[PDB]
Structures are given as structure tokens and as C-alpha cells.
């Protein structure tokens, strides 16, 4: 069977954005937000400095 199971999963970072979508904010706030939660580890602290 072509796709067998192929169950797309959660992934944490993926989980972080699902609530980003239903948080209310502006385009600039949603842009920085994608930036921030883009740069976040499996452990969960962020990789890059805030500056």
C-alpha cells in the first residue's frame, strides 16, 4: 500500500506553532514569533541569542 501508514507527527516545534496560530497578535508579532520558535531545540531552549 503506497503510503503504508505515513502518519505525520507532532514534533514540538510543530506544536509551538499550532498555538502560535491561535494566539492573537499582529503581522510583525507573528513574524518575530516564527522567528523565535524557529530557532528552538528538542530540549527546548533557544539556540540563538536574542540580539
Amino acid at each position: 500500500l503506497p503510503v503504508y501508514q505515513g502518519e505525520t507527527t507532532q514534533t514540538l516545534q510543530d506544536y509551538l506553532m499550532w498555538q502560535v496560530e491561535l494566539t492573537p497578535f499582529t503581522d510583525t508579532d507573528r513574524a518575530i514569533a516564527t522567528s523565535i520558535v524557529d530557532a528552538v531545540d528538542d530540549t527546548g531552549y533557544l539556540t540563538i541569542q536574542i540580539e
Binding site: 503506497p2 505515513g6 502518519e7 496560530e21 491561535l22 531552549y45
Partner: protein
């Protein structure tokens, strides 16, 4: 007189008018009889392994003077037991080892053997051994291999004509089906031409197969055709005409009969003329020349002077050629008859069609048919044609094949060769031509005389032969290459191929499948099923309309009722009660021999062929005392046309009325009052029942339930037992009396019950004991009660008080109204067992261990986990709690100042492990029954794994020490008895053993020797006990072997109690089902004149439409039974004397016509009547036969003894208004059974879950929180409404549109309710898949 101590507790009243002659057989012999002879050591090789060996076992090298034979094979003892195999998970089997013999000889000497290597046997695979119930333990689960039903090997002259001919002409082909190899067919064309066909491939000429078998034209013309003399000398043109041989043709002109003309010119031929011509001797009579033109010449004639090819074979004679052939060649020319009226050539028309006339040119045509290219070279064609059909080790059909071949051709001999022959094909084609001209009738595939069954034995034999013929090639190869060696016979004998083939056959096959463990009847009816699909017969369920029909030969061999109503209808059948297997492959049936009127008690088994000749009477026929008939005319069957015959014309009679019914439909009471479809669906739904906590015996039965229960092997019976000593909830011990006890044993039998074990159907198989303490149990008496059983009787359901009346529409069409009393009484409550399993799967980064050290979790979750991580036995768990705490190691890292600080602060984690603990799936709630852990060899972690090991060791010690204790007690009693009257009292031996004072000196001659012998025997017994305990302990904790990747396996079995509620699919035995829709309280339910409310309300508007009068009969009989039981209970509560109660029981047992003679006060004592009345105090057990049940008059008479209305009606009041109902409702007691189709598993909801990576569609049918599927008929219906927006929502919102789902979720949470379609991902996937080929495709603007 019937004692039946196990049945004496409760006797069921039978209503059988006819007297039973033959007893019910084991009912499971077809599954064990073949498997026994398959591994049975027989002195002659006919069947089994002795016949699969001798076939191709002698191995001969390629002129190497080295041979290999075998002496005999021996089946090794099994390693584990059935329970052990079920606990472990391994497949129960037995090793096979056969003593072989390799004999090497020197050259230059004829068969002079120099050395033999017959000193070592080799192990070649393990054979899966069967159990005592005809089942296997393959991979721990119980599987069954259903027997197949195919066509018997032989020749079948089918018609195959009608509308399929498309020419308005009848065809007559001929097919010969062997058991192995290629198939041959002789098809008939509308042009009166035959055609040879092999492997249903391109047709071939008719006489090419004859010319290939070294046959010439003259020989074929002389054999298939008859040649007349036709002696025309001196231009007389006279022919020898025989009226008895050839006649029926009008004479043209110039016809005489020995002088005076008998048949005038232009006169029609009459029988008187033929008689007059046959009376007088008729010599050669002159005939005109016109008869020579159309007539053909038989043989090829040549001139006396020269040898030209004039007047060739199969050529019409000419007028100009006649003069020269009469002048030069000869006078008498052999010719033919060619009578189109009663005969037809069908070959001479095809002889000219054959392009080849030589044997060499004809031998290459079949090869060109087989192989398209690579023409032969006078060496490949002959070899291929000889190996195709005339080979011994390549065709080898069967002995049944030769039997049918000889029977379909009127041959007396039945012992022939597996190979074919020339004369065989010749007579087959001759019979085909005769049938075309008309000489007999065609065969019948649906007839049970042309089809045979195959059990598991011959299938395993064939599989083993196929697996061994492959290793034989390797053995020959290894013996041909490097023969100069004296090694042991393990050159090419490899056990992997044969074992793998037999395991593939057993485990994964179309006929082998899991057995339904939901009901004991389901098991025994699955062990008797017969299927047509599989390796042979019907490749699929399609292409058949008349094959699935009920053939008239299905009287007492298969059942025309028990069969699924799905697409595979008619291809799945069941065996009858008395139906057995014929000698070779067919099904037989028993009858009684009728000799000059009287009926002898002897039994004779007949097949489908024998039954069609003799006259077989019907089971519903009157009988006298000596064996004669009452009425002179009796309805009987002769050849398929049932009619009346006198007492001097009948030859056989049936045995009983259950002969035409299978084991399933035989339990249906009053089966002659229900329709065929309803009885069919009831028998099919009976197999879907589920056992409950308290089993209740049925009040309206047939008596067959006892046999079905004792034969199914679902309970525990007492073998060779005399009395019971100790009783326990899971252990039974029986001290056998000295009568049935042989020396060399302690004299005790032990039975360990099965308490709460997971079945295949996730049900619960629990056994309850019957005896209480010190009860004399005989042989063949039951001890325990399996699932849905009661005192050895099959009881799957409860006797619920029902009534037939509509109740506020709650019983609209097929809904059942269940009162609250049934729910409160825990009736129909079901138990289910769930199994969870987890492995370790050692990885590269490190091994995984269960230490309950899970990070990122609360203490509340780990509050139910023990040290090693498993849950305590007896706890509960709901939702997604953790059961087994497993962790997965993570790869090491660098210094990592952040992780270094995190480890210095917290520690013990260091992000080394990940939470991978076994948690319960969502929507699951229950309680854990028991855990289990299996650890491979080499690993000895064993955190808390020694607990189950010590438990099993103590369980083994407890039941092993009993025999040794009994033996020691016997020996000590013998010691104490041998010292009597010798000056030593029993007090000294009772205080301390002291080995009988160590030969104190009672006699000093024989007493000392006796004491020494007794002490030696005691020491030997102690040593044997120690050795047995050591062996048992070594076998217990030896450890198992798991997968290479798997490190250890932890399993957990939990229990779930499911109660009744709306949605469940309740059903009966008369093809009546129902979905619960309401739980009505006790107050709202209607009550009777005594205040007792009904339990179940049913809809009476289904009886006149489904023909279910059987339901009303069962209700009346159950009401009578319940009235008798209530009167008995009142008598018991009044504490009356035993005499009146015994008289009432005796008067209630002998009521009705002469069916059975039983009476109390003569066999039952003053103590057994008490327990008898106490057992049947809630309903009178009644057993009505299938077609010999009780009559309406008897049912009405039975209602008078229990003070009940004979009409069966009774007034009822309303439980809500307190008003009396008009039209009194008939109440009764129906036996109801719960089906597996419950509402707790059907329901499934979803709003948003996980999607797939391909086509981005959700999972589906409840697989990890899936969703339903939309259909094409559904979008058609939607377009019928004109709902474009709803359709677009179903296409983008609830679909694979990724950029739309999140936006819709956001709009719904925010309350916008706006849709953005975009574009589905599946269209893009289709575009990419189309672009993957050489076809451009894109979308414009």
C-alpha cells in the same frame, strides 16, 4: 435403565417419538483420523510418511555406484506441553529423525558394495503435532486447517453447451483431470471437428495426438471405423448388406435381395422389409454406381504392377478413377459406411485438416504449441512429449484417478498405473464420439460422486513430498560431485528447506486460519467446515451460479442450512451428524438394511453412487414391533424422484431425523416450523454468541447440546476415576479405585483448570468445578464446566421472560426492550481480556532497560509502578496511564557547558534517556489480571523476574509431591504391616520411622531382607523424586530464545467487564435479532395478575412475515417448563414430604405419548430425589428433537399440569396507568444469546488527528483515532441536492488541503465561519505522478 451419575443430578425430559438406533459419533473424527495415520508406523507404504518416503527416497548418483536408503523413521518426543507452548508462544511440534543408510560400492563389479554408513540418523525439520481436540498450537495461538472440497481426479464428459455456444448447437467436450501435472481436453467444434487442447492453450488438430503415438492412417481408420468388404469383381458391383448391422435408409433404385426384389425403388424403408431381409440369407447384392461417389475408401490401395499413390487414404471415389482402380489395382476395395443418422465420422473430416502426415512432422507441432521458439532436433520433442504424459515420476495422478478412469469406462479392474496409455486415449475419444452420436448421458460436477474432500493429512503429505523432492536434487548433486569420500550422510541433507516449507504451509495459508474461541459450538462447527476455495477447485468466489446450489445428493452428507449468506454463499458447507468419509475421498452416510419387510439393526454406509441405485425410505415412517410397516404405501426415494412404494420395493431406511442436519442447526428447537432463510441466519448467529458470568441451562432444547459440549473438548472430564478426595477452584484430584488401576502407579489423577486465560476472540475461558467433596465419579463423567456450559450441557444464553406486544414504538421494527431487572441481575454480562506487549530492541547507542526512572513525569503516575516498572497484579488503569517504564538511550555528547551545568545541578538524567514507557491507548479502562516477562539467554538482569519463576516452581512442587507422598505412605503402611505379630507394636512406627528399628530382629531370616528391600525402594523413590524436581526446575527457568534485535519481552493481560446497554445486538435461535434501544425500569414494565413484571418486550409483527411459529412454540414450552419449576419450588418451600414430591415428579416425567420409559422410586434413593428436585427447581428441562419434537396437543396438555391456560394467553396491566389491557398477550420464556457486535467498540468519533504523508489524507477506520470515508454515491446524493458550498467544504476543509485546515480551525475558534478552499494536495500529487512519465501537463491562466 439410565444411571448417568453425572447427569442424574438433572434429567431432561425428551419428546422423541422415533427410537434412537445409532449413537452420535465422536463428531470430531475427520480432524484426527487423518493426522493419526499421517504419522502412523504402517508395515506397508500406502499413506502417511511411509508412502511419502518410498516414492523418491532411493538416491542414485550419475553412474557413481553410490546409493542412499532409509531403514525407518521415528517421531521424537515433544519438548514442551500444550499449556507450556501457549504460555511461551512457541509452536507445538515434534522433531523428526530417520535412520538412513549410505552405501558406496567399488567399480568393475556388478552391484558389489564395499562400505555402508548406516550408523547415524539426521534430523530433518520438525512436524507440527496436533492436540487432543484436532487443533495446533502454531505460534502459541490455536489454528485450524479447514478441509477442502475439490473435483476427484478422472475423466468428465461434460456438455458445456446452450446459450454459450452462440450457434444454436449442442457441444460435447471431454476433459481428463489428473492430480498432478498437465491437463488434457478433447473439445468439440460446431463443424463436427474434434480438437486436442493442453493447459487450456491454443487448440490442436484431432488426430495429431494419435499420429504422435506411433499410429498410422490405416491403423486409425481400421480401429476407429468399421470397414465393409465391398467386393466388386467382374464389374458386378455387389456389396454385402446386413440388415441387422446397418439399416434405416431408403433405397434409391436397382436394389434386390437374393433374387426377388424385397425393397422397391423409391419406397420407404420399413421394419417388415428389414425382418424379411434378416430372415433369409442375403449374399452380395448389386448396387448402382452412385453409391461409390459419396463413399470414401478406408485403406490405401496400390496397383499390382506399379506402386503409385493412386486411391489415397481418406479420399472419395470418383467415376473416372473407378475404372482404372478396378483394372489395375484390385476388385475388392475397403470402404466406409458414413451413416449420419446414428453415427458421425468427426475424424475423417479432420484427417485432411492435419498439415502433417509423418510422425516426425507431427511430433514438432505439439512442441511448437508448447514452446514458441527453439525448434527441436529429433531429441527434445520426443523427450518432452514422453515426459509430459507418459512419464512415471511426472504425472503419477493417484489410485483414485485410476479407479475413476476404470469406473467411467466400464472396466472391472481397479489397480492400474499412474501413467497414461494409447488405448486409454483411444477409448476416451471413442466414448466421446459415441456420446456425440448418443450412447449415454453426460456427467455432473455438482453430483457428490464426482467430487471428493481432502483433509489435513494428505495435504501435509503432499507438502512434505514437495519439500523432500527438492532436497533430493541437492543430495544427487552432492553424491555426483566428489564421490571419493567416506563422510557421514550429511552431504546435502538440509533441514531448513523442508521445515520452512511445512511452516509456510501450516502458518500462513488460505485454508489455515485462527479458530473462533467465543463458543464451544463455534469451535466444533469450525472443525467440521468444508471450503471450496484454496489451492485448487475454485480460484475465487465468482464465476458460478449453479455450483452453489443445493444438489439432491446433499441429503445426508452436507447441510443445506448451515452456510454463510455473504458472497461466499454455497462454497462453505458443514458436515452432517452421521456423515463420514469414504475409503478414498468421498462422503458416506449410514442406512439400515431392510430384508423382506423387516428392518435389521445392522448399519451400512453408502455413497452418492450407491444411494442412487437402491430404494431408501424416509425417517418419518411408521414401524411395527417386529420391524414391519403399518401402511402398505411408504414414501421413499429411488433415483431422485421421491414417490410411494410398497413394503416389498424398499431396500434401505434412514437412521434418525438428525441425519440431514448439521451440528449447528440441530440445536434449533422446532426447526420444522421456521423458514429456510430464518433457520440459516439463526444457525449463523448462534456462532457469534459470547459467554457470560453465570451460565443458565436452556428450558427448550434438543438433547444434542450434551454431545456438542462433551465432544468439543472445552471442559474437563474424569478419565479412569473412582472417587474424589480434594476439590479446589483450580485443582481437581481423583483417587482411582483398584478396579481400573494398574500396578506401577500411585493411583491418582490430577486436573488443572483454566482460569481467566485470553482467547483468540479476546474472550474469557474460565472453568468452574461441579463436585463438592467426596463424590463417586465414574468414567466419562464431566468434572469442570467450560465457557457457556452447565452440568455438561451447552448453554449459551439465558431464559428471559418475553412477551409479544408493541410498547410505545420502542419495538418499532427490530428493537428489543430490556427491563431494568435484567441489568440489575447482571445477566448477559460479558468479560473480555486485553493483551499488551513491549520489547526492548537494543540499539547502537546502548541497551534499553526497564528501571522505572522516567524523566518528565509526575509521582502520581509512578504511584502504581513497582521497582522494575511493571504494575502490581490486581490494580486498575484508565485512559493513558503507564504500565511498563522503558527508556531509550541517547548518544553521548561533547563537554557541553549547558548540559554539563544541567547535569551538575539535577543529575541522574543528563538527557541520556527518552520517555518510551508503555502506556494504555486512549478510550481504554480496566483492571490488570497478570504480567509476564521473558528474558533471552545471556542477560541476567532479573529485577523482579524471579517471582513468577518461584511461583511456577512451587506450583510444580505442590502437584508433583502428591504422588511421592502417596507412594511413601503406601510403603510405610507396608512396613508397619510386615512387622505385625513380631513383637513390635504400631506405636513405635507411628512415633518415629527409624526404618522399622533397622532390622530389630523380629524374624532374622526374611524380615531383615524385607526391611532392606523396602529401605532400598524408599531410597530409590527419594532419588527419583529429587531427579524429577531437578529436571522440572531446570526446564522452568532455563530461559527462552527471542529475536536477535529483541532483548526481552514484557506482556500484560488485563480484564474488562462489559454490561448490557442500548446499541448491543441481542439475538435468538430462530433467526431473530434486535438492537437494544431502551433500558426500562421495573415499574414501567407491564405486570401480570400476580405482580411479576416481564423482562423483555418483543414486537409480534415479525412472525407472519418471517414464518417464526417456532418462537411461539418455544415460548409456550418454556412457560409450561417455568410453571412446573415454580410448582416444584413451591413444594420445596412448603417443606412437604418426599413421597408427594416424588409422585409429582414421576407424573410430570411420564406425561405425553410413548417416548421414553423412566420412573423414580426404583433407582433414585430417598436422598437423590432431594438434589434432583433442587436442581430443576427453576424450570423443567425439555428436549425436543429436530424433526421429531413435541406436538401442539402435548404442549397444551403440559400447560394443564402446572395450572396454566392451554391457549397460552394471559391478561396484563399497564405499569404506568394501572389499566387492564385487552387482547391478552401471550407471555413465555425465550432463550436469548448476546452477540459480539456490541456498541462499546462500534462507536468512534474524531475532530482532528494525524494525517498521512502521501495524499495528506487522515488514517481511516479507527486506526489510531481515524475518521470515516466519504463515498461516490454520497457526492452523487449531495449533487442531487445542489449543495455546492457543502461539497467545497468536504473537498477543502475536511480534506488534504494543508493551508486550509489551520485557517478553518482559527476561524472556528475565533467565530468567523469563513472558508478558504485553495487547492487540495492530492491534485498536486496526481500532477507529479503524471509528470513522472513522458507526458507534459500543466494548468494555464
Amino acid at each position: 435403565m439410565v444411571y448417568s451419575y453425572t447427569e442424574k443430578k438433572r434429567i431432561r425430559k425428551d419428546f422423541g417419538k422415533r427410537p434412537q438406533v445409532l449413537d452420535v459419533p465422536y463428531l470430531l473424527s475427520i480432524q484426527l483420523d487423518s493426522f493419526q495415520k499421517f504419522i502412523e508406523q504402517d508395515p506397508e507404504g500406502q499413506y502417511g510418511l511411509e508412502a511419502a518416503f518410498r516414492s523418491v527416497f532411493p538416491i542414485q548418483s550419475y553412474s557413481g555406484n553410490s546409493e542412499l536408503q532409509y531403514v525407518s523413521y521415528r517421531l521424537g518426543e515433544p519438548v514442551f506441553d500444550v499449556q507450556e507452548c501457549q504460555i511461551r508462544g512457541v509452536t507445538y511440534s515434534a522433531p523428526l529423525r530417520v535412520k538412513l543408510r549410505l552405501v558406496i560400492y567399488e567399480r568393475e563389479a556388478p552391484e558389489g558394495t564395499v562400505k555402508d554408513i548406516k550408523e547415524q540418523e539426521v534430523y530433518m525439520g520438525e512436524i507440527p503435532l496436533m492436540t487432543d481436540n484436532g487443533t495446533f498450537v502454531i505460534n502459541g495461538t490455536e489454528r485450524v486447517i479447514v478441509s477442502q472440497l475439490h473435483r476427484s481426479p478422472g475423466v468428465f464428459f461434460d456438455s458445456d453447451k446452450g446459450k454459450t455456444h452462440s450457434s444454436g448447437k449442442v457441444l460435447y467436450n471431454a476433459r481428463i483431470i489428473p492430480y498432478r501435472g498437465s491437463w488434457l481436453d478433447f473439445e468439440f467444434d460446431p463443424k463436427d471437428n474434434l480438437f486436442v487442447r493442453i493447459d487450456r492453450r491454443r487448440k490442436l488438430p484431432a488426430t495429431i495426438i494419435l499420429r504422435a503415438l506411433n499410429y498410422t492412417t490405416e491403423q486409425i481408420l481400421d480401429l476407429f471405423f468399421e470397414k465393409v468388404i465391398f467386393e466388386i469383381r467382374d464389374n458386378k458391383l455387389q456389396m454385402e448388406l446386413v440388415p441387422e448391422r446397418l439399416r434405416g435408409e431408403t433405397a434409391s433404385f436397382d436394389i434386390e435381395a437374393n433374387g426377388k426384389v424385397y425393397v422397391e425403388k423409391g419406397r420407404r424403408i420399413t421394419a417388415r422389409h428389414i425382418r424379411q431381409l434378416e430372415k433369409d440369407d442375403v449374399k452380395l447384392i448389386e448396387v448402382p454406381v452412385e453409391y461409390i461417389a459419396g463413399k470414401v475408401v478406408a485403406k490405401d490401395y496400390i496397383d499390382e504392377s506399379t506402386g503409385e499413390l493412386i486411391c489415397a487414404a481418406n479420399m472419395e471415389l470418383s467415376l473416372d478413377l473407378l475404372a482404372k482402380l478396378s483394372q489395375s489395382g484390385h476388385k475388392r476395395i475397403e470402404t466406409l459406411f458414413t451413416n449420419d443418422l446414428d453415427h458421425g465420422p468427426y475424424i475423417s473430416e479432420t484427417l485432411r485438416v492435419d498439415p502433417t502426415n509423418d510422425r516426425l512432422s507431427a511430433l514438432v507441432e505439439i512442441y511448437r504449441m508448447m514452446r514458441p521458439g527453439e525448434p527441436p532436433t529429433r531429441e527434445a520433442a520426443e523427450s518432452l512429449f514422453e515426459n509430459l504424459f507418459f512419464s512415471e515420476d511426472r504425472y503419477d495422478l493417484s489410485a483414485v484417478g485410476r479407479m475413476k478412469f476404470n469406473r467411467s469406462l466400464l472396466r472391472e479392474e481397479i489397480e492400474g498405473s499412474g501413467i497414461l496409455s494409447k488405448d486409454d486415449i483411444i477409448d476416451v475419444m471413442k466414448k466421446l464420439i459415441d456420446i456425440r452420436n448418443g450412447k449415454g448421458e453426460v456427467d455432473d460436477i455438482d453430483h457428490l460422486g464426482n467430487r471428493r474432500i481432502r483433509s489435513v493429512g494428505e495435504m501435509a503429505e503432499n507438502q512434505f513430498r514437495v519439500g523432500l523432492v527438492r532436497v533430493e536434487r541437492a543430495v544427487k548433486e552432492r553424491l555426483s560431485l566428489g564421490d571419493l569420500d567416506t563422510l557421514m550422510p550429511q552431504d546435502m541433507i538440509n533441514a531448513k528447506p523442508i521445515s520452512a516449507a511445512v511452516k509456510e504451509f501450516f502458518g500462513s495459508s488460505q485454508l489455515s486460519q485462527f479458530m473462533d474461541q467465543n463458543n464451544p459450538l463455534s469451535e466444533i462447527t469450525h472443525k467440521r467446515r468444508i471450503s471450496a476455495l484454496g489451492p485448487g477447485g475454485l480460484t475465487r468466489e465468482r464465476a458460478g451460479f449453479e455450483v452453489r446450489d443445493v444438489h439432491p445428493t446433499h441429503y445426508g452428507r452436507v447441510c443445506p442450512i448451515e452456510t454463510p449468506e455473504g458472497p461466499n454463499i454455497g462454497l462453505i458447507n458443514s458436515l452432517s451428524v452421521y456423515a463420514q468419509t469414504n475409503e478414498y475421498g468421498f462422503l458416506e452416510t449410514p442406512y439400515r438394511k431392510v430384508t423382506d419387510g423387516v428392518v435389521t439393526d445392522e448399519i451400512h454406509y453408502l455413497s452418492a453412487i450407491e444411494e442412487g441405485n437402491y430404494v431408501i425410505a424416509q425417517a418419518n415412517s411408521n414401524l411395527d414391533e417386529e420391524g414391519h410397516f403399518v401402511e402398505d404405501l411408504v414414501t421413499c426415494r429411488s433415483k431422485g424422484e421421491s414417490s410411494l412404494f410398497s413394503r416389498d420395493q424398499v431396500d434401505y431406511m434412514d437412521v434418525s431425523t438428525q441425519q440431514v442436519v448439521s451440528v449447528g442447526a440441530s440445536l434449533i428447537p422446532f426447526l420444522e416450523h421456521d423458514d429456510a432463510n430464518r433457520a440459516l441466519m439463526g444457525a449463523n448467529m448462534q456462532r457469534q454468541a459470547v459467554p457470560t458470568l453465570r451460565a443458565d441451562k436452556p428450558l427448550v432444547g434438543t438433547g444434542m447440546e450434551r454431545a456438542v459440549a462433551v465432544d468439543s473438548g472445552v471442559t474437563a472430564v474424569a478419565k479412569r476415576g473412582g472417587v474424589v478426595q480434594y476439590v479446589d477452584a483450580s485443582r481437581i484430584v481423583i483417587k482411582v479405585n483398584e478396579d481400573e488401576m494398574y500396578p506401577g502407579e500411585a493411583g491418582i489423577d490430577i486436573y488443572n483448570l483454566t482460569k481467566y486465560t485470553r482467547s483468540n476472540q479476546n474472550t474469557c475461558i474460565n472453568q468452574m468445578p461441579c463436585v463438592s467433596l467426596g463424590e463417586p465419579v465414574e468414567r466419562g463423567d464431566v468434572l469442570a464446566d467450560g465457557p457457556s456450559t452447565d452440568l455438561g450441557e451447552l448453554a449459551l444464553g439465558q431464559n428471559m421472560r418475553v412477551a409479544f406486544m408493541p410498547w410505545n414504538g420502542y419495538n418499532f421494527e427490530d428493537s428489543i426492550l430490556v427491563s431494568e431487572r435484567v441489568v440489575q441481575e447482571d445477566r448477559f454480562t460479558t468479560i473480555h481480556i486485553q493483551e499488551l506487549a513491549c520489547v526492548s530492541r537494543d540499539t547502537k547507542l546502548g541497551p534499553e532497560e526497564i528501571t522505572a526512572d522516567i524523566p518528565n513525569v509526575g509521582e502520581a503516575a509512578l504511584s502504581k509502578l513497582d521497582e522494575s516498572g511493571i504494575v502490581y497484579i490486581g490494580a486498575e488503569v484508565t485512559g493513558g496511564d503507564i504500565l511498563v517504564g522503558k527508556v531509550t538511550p541517547k548518544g553521548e555528547t561533547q563537554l557541553t557547558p549547558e548540559e554539563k551545568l544541567l547535569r551538575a545541578i539535577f543529575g541522574e538524567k543528563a538527557s541520556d534517556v527518552k520517555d518510551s514507557s508503555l502506556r494504555v491507548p486512549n478510550g481504554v479502562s480496566g483492571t490488570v489480571i497478570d504480567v509476564q516477562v521473558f528474558t533471552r539467554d545471556g542477560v541476567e538482569k532479573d529485577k523482579r523476574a524471579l517471582e513468577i519463576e518461584e511461583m511456577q516452581l512451587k506450583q510444580a512442587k505442590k502437584d508433583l509431591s502428591e504422588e511421592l507422598q502417596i507412594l511413601e505412605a503406601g510403603l510405610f503402611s507396608r512396613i508397619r504391616a510386615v512387622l505385625v505379630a513380631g513383637g513390635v507394636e504400631a506405636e513405635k512406627l507411628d512415633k518415629l520411622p527409624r526404618d522399622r528399628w533397622l532390622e530389630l530382629g523380629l524374624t532374622d531370616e526374611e524380615k531383615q531382607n524385607q526391611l532392606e528391600q523396602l529401605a532400598e525402594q524408599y531410597d530409590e523413590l527419594k532419588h527419583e523424586f529429587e531427579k524429577k524436581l531437578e529436571a522440572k526446575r531446570r526446564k522452568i527457568t532455563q530461559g527462552d530464545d527471542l529475536a536477535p534485535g529483541v532483548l526481552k519481552i514484557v506482556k500484560v493481560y488485563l480484564a474488562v467487564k462489559r454490561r448490557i446497554q442500548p446499541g448491543d445486538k441481542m439475538a435468538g435461535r430462530h433467526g431473530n435479532k434486535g438492537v437494544i434501544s431502551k433500558i426500562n425500569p421495573i415499574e414501567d414494565m407491564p405486570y401480570d395478575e400476580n405482580g411479576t413484571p416481564v423482562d423483555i418486550v418483543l414486537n409480534p409483527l415479525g412472525v407472519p412475515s418471517r414464518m417464526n411459529i417456532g418462537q411461539i412454540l418455544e415460548t409456550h414450552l418454556g412457560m409450561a417448563a417455568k410453571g412446573i419449576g415454580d410448582k416444584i419450588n413451591a413444594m420445596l418451600k412448603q417443606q412437604q414430604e418426599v413421597a408427594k414430591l416424588r409422585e409429582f415428579i414421576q407424573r410430570a416425567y411420564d406425561l405425553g405419548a410413548d417416548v421414553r420409559q423412566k420412573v423414580d422410586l426404583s433407582t433414585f434413593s430417598d436422598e437423590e430425589v432431594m438434589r434432583l428436585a433442587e436442581n430443576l427447581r427453576k424450570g423443567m428441562p425439555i428436549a425436543t428433537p429436530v424433526f421429531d419434537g413435541a406436538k401442539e396437543a402435548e404442549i397444551k396438555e403440559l400447560l394443564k399440569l402446572g395450572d396454566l391456560p392451554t391457549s397460552g394467553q394471559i391478561r396484563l396491566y399497564d405499569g404506568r396507568t394501572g389499566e387492564q389491557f385487552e387482547r391478552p398477550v401471550t407471555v413465555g420464556y425465550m432463550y436469548m444469546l448476546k452477540l459480539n457486535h456490541l456498541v462499546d467498540d462500534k462507536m468512534h468519533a474524531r475532530s482532528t488527528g494525524s494525517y498521512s504523508l502521501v495524499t495528506q489524507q487522515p488514517l481511516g477506520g479507527k486506526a489510531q483515532f481515524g475518521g470515516q470515508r466519504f463515498g461516490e454515491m454520497e457526492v452523487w446524493a449531495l449533487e442531487a441536492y445542489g449543495a455546492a458550498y457543502t461539497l467545497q467544504e468536504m473537498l477543502t476543509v475536511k480534506s488534504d488541503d494543508v493551508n486550509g485546515r489551520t485557517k478553518m480551525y482559527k476561524n472556528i475558534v475565533d467565530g468567523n465561519h469563513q472558508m478558504e478552499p485553495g487547492m487540495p494536495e492530492s491534485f498536486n500529487v496526481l500532477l507529479k505522478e503524471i509528470r513522472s512519465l513522458g507526458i507534459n501537463i500543466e494548468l494555464e491562466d
